[PDB]
């Protein structure tokens, strides 16, 4: 349950980043992505989400930005 909530919180931020990509505004995407980064890094340690998967998401988001 707790782990599920930890997972849940990230998805909203990633959806917001996707909306920022759709807007095509640099700062709005940048703030949301920087807000997300540390939480994903933290979740990586727990083992809920794969570290390789997190790195792939970071590379994709950086390429999109």
């Amino acid at each position: 349950q707790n782990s599920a909530s930890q997972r849940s919180m990230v998805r909203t931020y990633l959806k917001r980043v996707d909306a920022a990509i759709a807007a095509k505004d640099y700062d709005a995407a940048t703030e949301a992505y920087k807000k997300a980064i540390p939480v994903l890094d933290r979740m990586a340690d727990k083992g809920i989400i794969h570290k390789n998967k997190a790195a792939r998401r970071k590379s994709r988001l950086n390429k999109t930005i």
Partner: protein
């Protein structure tokens, strides 16, 4: 069908997703499948083959006056291998998509029927701070609750997590064990609509 929010707003929820008759056997099967898939199933014992040593016949077949033995690591002996030694197992069950959806439907219907579901227009915590959530719960008269709504904000998550029995989950990632377990449920009308579409 026609429910009230805490404020008083009327909400229209479909009957197939919030009014389906309770099926205790189906809900039982889905809940037990979720609990069984919560298992890790990581353990093992050592069979006589893999127990250290034991390759030689302890004594000759006849003439010693002893019960015959072939190895010192047979399961009869102390320190020997386990007859039918356990190995890692996969305890996950395949729940039919429709069976799971119907179990969720019945769980929600029975929650409404026993008044353990509470509709709210919105629940947004202004700042990350447990006491604000506690104050909101004080007026809602729900000390222990499960909160499910469109999206989970970091501040609401940080406020909720510390609280003993308060948990927050997104509508898509919702489990029957959680819905059944937590005594009261706080849920938004938009999340309810998305449950209708999902189920």
């Amino acid at each position: 069908m026609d429910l009230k929010t805490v404020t008083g707003a009327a909400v229209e929820l479909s009957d197939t997703a919030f009014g389906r008759e309770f099926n205790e056997a189906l809900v039982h099967q889905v809940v037990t499948a979720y609990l069984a898939g919560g298992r890790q199933g990581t353990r093992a014992q050592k069979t006589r083959a893999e127990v250290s040593g034991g390759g030689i016949k302890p004594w000759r077949q006849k003439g010693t006056g002893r019960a015959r033995a072939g190895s010192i690591r047979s399961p009869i002996w102390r320190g020997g291998g386990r007859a039918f030694a356990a190995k890692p197992q996969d305890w996950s069950q395949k729940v039919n998509r429709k069976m799971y959806r119907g179990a969720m439907q019945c769980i929600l219907a029975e929650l409404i029927r026993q008044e353990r579901l509470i509709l709210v227009e919105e629940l947004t915590i202004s700042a990350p701070k447990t006491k604000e959530l506690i104050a909101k719960l004080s007026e809602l008269n729900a000390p222990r609750a499960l909160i499910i709504t469109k999206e989970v904000d970091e501040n609401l998550y940080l406020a909720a997590r510390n609280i003993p029995h308060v948990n927050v989950l997104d509508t898509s990632e919702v489990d029957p064990v959680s819905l059944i377990a937590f005594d009261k449920v706080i849920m938004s009308v938009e999340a309810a609509k998305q449950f209708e579409e999902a189920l």
